[PDB]
Amino acid sequence: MLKLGVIGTGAISHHFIEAAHTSGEYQLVAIYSRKLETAATFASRYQNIQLFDQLEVFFKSSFDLVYIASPNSLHFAQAKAALSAGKHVILEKPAVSQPQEWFDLIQTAEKNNCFIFEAARNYHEKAFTTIKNFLADKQVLGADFNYAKYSSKGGALMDLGIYPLYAAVRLFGKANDATYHAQQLDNSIDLNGDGILFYPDYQVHIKAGKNITSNLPCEIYTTDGTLTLNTIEHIRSAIFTDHQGNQVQLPIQQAPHTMTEEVAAFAHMIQQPDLNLYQTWLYDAGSVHELLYTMRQTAGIRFEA
Amino acid sequence: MLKLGVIGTGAISHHFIEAAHTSGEYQLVAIYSRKLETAATFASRYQNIQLFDQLEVFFKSSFDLVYIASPNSLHFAQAKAALSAGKHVILEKPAVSQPQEWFDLIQTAEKNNCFIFEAARNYHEKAFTTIKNFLADKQVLGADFNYAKYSSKMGGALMDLGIYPLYAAVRLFGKANDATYHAQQLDNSIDLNGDGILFYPDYQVHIKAGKNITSNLPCEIYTTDGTLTLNTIEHIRSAIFTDHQGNQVQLPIQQAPHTMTEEVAAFAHMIQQPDLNLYQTWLYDAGSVHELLYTMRQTAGIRFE
> Distance (Å) from the C-alpha of residue B181 to the closest C-alpha of chain A?
10
**What's the CA gap between B61 and A234, in Å, rounded?**
66
Those residues with Cβ within 8 angstroms of residue B192's Cβ, 6 or more apart along the chain or in another chain: B157, B183, B184, B185, B186, B210, B211, B212, B213
**What's the CA gap between B117 and B271, in Å, rounded?**
11
Q: How many CB atoms lie within 10 A of CB B124?
A: 24
Concatenated DSSP letters of B219-282 = EEEEETTEEEEES-SSS---EEEEETTS-EEE------SSTTHHHHHHHHHHHHS--HHHHHHH
Nearest chain A residue to B225 by CA distance is A212
Is there a single domain that holds both residue A147 and residue A288? yes
Radius of gyration over alpha carbons of chain B, in Å? 20
Is there a single domain that holds both residue B100 and residue B135? no
End-of-domain residue from the set B113, B147, B167:
B113
CB contact under 8 A, A213 and B226: yes
Is there a single domain that holds both residue A154 and residue A247? yes
Residue A119 lies in a domain: no
Q: Sign of the CA dihedral A180, A183, A188, A191?
A: negative
Residue A36 lies in a domain: yes
Find out whether A222 and A135 touch, Cβ atoms under 8 Å: yes
Confirm or reject contact between B27 and chain A (CB < 8 A): no
A193 burial class (0-12, 13-18, 19+ CB within 10 angstroms)?
buried
Find the helix packing angle between B276-300 and B99-112, rounded to 10°.
160
Is there a single domain that holds both residue B107 and residue B132? no
Number of domains within chain B:
2
Those residues with Cβ within 8 angstroms of residue B155's Cβ, 6 or more apart along the chain or in another chain: B72, B190
How far is CA B269 from each of CA B14, B91, B122, rounded to the nearest angstrom?
21, 17, 17
| 3-state DSSP assignment of residue B209 | strand
Q: Write the residue in A181, A219, A226 that is nearest to B204 by C-beta.
A: A181
**What's the CA gap between A145 and A209, in Å, rounded?**
12
End-of-domain residue from the set A64, A80, A113:
A113
Residue A118 lies in a domain: no
| 3-state DSSP assignment of residue A159 | helix
Residue B48 lies in a domain: yes
CB contact under 8 A, A202 and B184: yes
Helices (H) and strands (E) in chain B, counts: 10, 14
Buried b (16+ CB within 10 A) or exposed e, B42-74: beeeeeebbbbeebeebbebebbbbbbbbebee
How far is CA B120 from each of CA A7, A236, B100, B163, B261, rounded to the nearest angstrom?
58, 39, 19, 9, 12
Q: Write the residue in A207, A225, A228 that is nearest to B206 by C-beta.
A: A207
Kindly list the strands in the beta sheet with B26-32, ordered across the sheet, starting from the edge strand earlier in the chain: B50-52, B26-32, B2-5, B65-68, B88-91, B116-118
Residue B228 lies in a domain: yes
Method: X-ray
Q: Which residues pair with B220 in a beta bridge?
A: B144, B229
Is there a single domain that holds both residue B18 and residue B80? yes
> The CATH number of the domain where A63 resides is what?
3.40.50.720
Is there a single domain that holds both residue A137 and residue A109? no
How far is CA B207 from each of CA A48, A71, B96, B246, B248, rounded to the nearest angstrom?
55, 34, 20, 26, 25
End-of-domain residue from the set B50, B84, B113:
B113
Residues on chain B touching A195 (C-beta within 8 angstroms): none
Q: Residues for chain A: how many in total?
A: 305
Interface test with B, best of A147, A180, A190, A194 (most B CBs within 10 A): A194
Residue A212 lies in a domain: yes
> The CATH number of the domain where A149 resides is what?
3.30.360.10
CA atoms within 13 A on the CB side of A236: 5
**What's the CA gap between B244 and B181, in Å, rounded?**
31
CB contact under 8 A, B144 and A207: yes
> Beta strands of chain A (E only): which ranges?
2-7, 26-32, 50-52, 65-68, 88-91, 116-118, 140-148, 177-184, 190-198, 203-209, 218-222, 225-229, 238-242, 247-249
Is there a single domain that holds both residue A104 and residue A239? no
**What's the CA gap between B190 and B302, in Å, rounded?**
6
Residue A123 lies in a domain: no
Interface test with A, best of B151, B215, B230 (most A CBs within 10 A): B215
CB contact under 8 A, A142 and B193: yes
CB contact under 8 A, A215 and B199: no
Is there a single domain that holds both residue A143 and residue A174? yes
**What's the CA gap between A164 and B42, in Å, rounded?**
50
**What's the CA gap between B108 and B114, in Å, rounded?**
9
Residues on chain A touching B150 (C-beta within 8 angstroms): 243
Buried b (16+ CB within 10 A) or exposed e, B152-161: eeebbbbbbb
**What's the CA gap between B220 and A146, in Å, rounded?**
13
Is there a single domain that holds both residue B101 and residue B167? no
| 3-state DSSP assignment of residue A110 | helix
Pairing between β-strand B191-199 and β-strand B88-91 as defined by DSSP bridges: unpaired
How far is CA B231 from each of CA B127, B209, B212, rounded to the nearest angstrom?
12, 16, 21
Confirm or reject contact between A250 and chain B (CB < 8 A): no
Query: Residues 180 to 199 of A: which have CB under 8 A from any B CB?
Result: 181, 183, 191-194, 196, 198
Pairing between β-strand B226-230 and β-strand B219-223 as defined by DSSP bridges: antiparallel
Find out whether A108 and A83 touch, Cβ atoms under 8 Å: yes
Residues on chain B touching A215 (C-beta within 8 angstroms): 218, 220, 227, 229
Backbone angles phi, psi at A157, to 5 degrees: -55, -55
**What's the CA gap between B190 and B213, in Å, rounded?**
15
**What's the CA gap between A157 and A179, in Å, rounded?**
12
Question: Cis link prior to B3 (omega < 30° from 0)?
Answer: no
**What's the CA gap between A248 and A261, in Å, rounded?**
24
Confirm or reject contact between A164 and chain B (CB < 8 A): no
Is there a single domain that holds both residue B105 and residue B74? yes
Find out whether B193 and B184 touch, Cβ atoms under 8 Å: yes
Is there a single domain that holds both residue A94 and residue A232? no
> Distance (Å) from the C-alpha of residue A123 to the closest C-alpha of chain B?
24
Those residues with Cβ within 8 angstroms of residue A204's Cβ, 6 or more apart along the chain or in another chain: A142, A143, A144, A145, A168, A172, A175, A196, A197
Which amino acid is located at B115 in the chain?
Answer: F
Residues on chain B touching A194 (C-beta within 8 angstroms): 195, 197, 204, 206
Residues on chain B touching A142 (C-beta within 8 angstroms): 184, 193, 210, 213
Is there a single domain that holds both residue B88 and residue B142? no
Helices (H) and strands (E) in chain A, counts: 10, 14
Residue A89 lies in a domain: yes
Q: Write the residue in B199, B217, B224 that is nearest to A219 by C-beta.
A: B217
User: Which residues constitute the domain of residue A218?
Assistant: 128-305
Size of interface A-B (CB pairs under 8 A): 89
Q: Which residues pair with A66 in a beta bridge?
A: A5, A89
